[PDB]
Amino acid sequence: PQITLWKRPLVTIKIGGQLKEALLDTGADDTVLEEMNLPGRWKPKMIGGIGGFIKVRQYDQILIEICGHKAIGTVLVGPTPVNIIGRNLLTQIGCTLNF
Amino acid sequence: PQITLWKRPLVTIKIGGQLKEALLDTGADDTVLEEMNLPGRWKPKMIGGIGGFIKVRQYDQILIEICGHKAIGTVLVGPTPVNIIGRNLLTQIGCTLNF
Numbered sequence A, B: 001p002q003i004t005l006w007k008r009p010l011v012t013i014k015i016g017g018q019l020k021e022a023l024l025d026t027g028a029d030d031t032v033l034e035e036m037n038l039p040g041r042w043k044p045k046m047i048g049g050i051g052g053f054i055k056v057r058q059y060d061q062i063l064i065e066i067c068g069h070k071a072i073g074t075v076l077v078g079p080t081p082v083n084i085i086g087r088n089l090l091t092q093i094g095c096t097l098n099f
């Protein structure tokens, strides 16, 4: 579909058997999800933005379905205020900026 | 143009008569630029990112040119890690997400 930017580009996603709302974020290198209990191994990471850094847990090869489009890649989990779909997964669903 | 997301969506902007590089950031409500000298008056404001809240200078009705597209809107100036173009200006140049 085509999504205008009058409002936040929030879409429904499916990850780890849960439906959530997440931001399609072209400014996010990586995908960062609100705190959740995912199984499997992980490694710690820190990611920076406005206000400083947050500590996150990095899971690899995590499947996420975005508006019916399937994608699999690295997913960071930590105390983010919002679910953020980053470019690592946006590329996989064929998302582009257009103007 | 149609911009894929395998790289950061970085573009050249023109503000205050000076060229800079900025990130098209659909996950940002507002446009936030690194510390710089801008003409006109400003008001102190606070914005929160992933890592917390920062102090910024708010400039209203500022002319910015993005990839040759003219916009006039609010521009926040403060200690952001990257020049980011937010939805307040992305809408003015006709930007949409598509997949």
Ligand SMILES: CC[C@H](C)CN(C[C@@H](O)[C@H](Cc1ccccc1)NC(=O)O[C@H]1CO[C@H]2OCC[C@H]21)S(=O)(=O)c1ccc2c(c1)OCO2
Binding pocket: A025, A026, A027, A028, A029, A030, A031, A032, A047, A048, A049, A050, A081, A082, A084, A086, B025, B026, B027, B028, B029, B030, B031, B032, B047, B048, B049, B050, B051, B081, B082, B084, B086
């Ligand atoms: C360094 C470039 C940006 C600041 C990076 N951010 C993505 C933004 O889209 C962020 C995503 C975002 C959105 C809401 C809350 C927290 C983070 N939005 C943001 O900070 O916008 C602010 C300015 O406008 C205001 O509206 C939204 C917040 C304000 S981020 O969330 O900090 C981020 C996400 C994934 C990352 C990462 C940083 O490092 C590598 O992987």
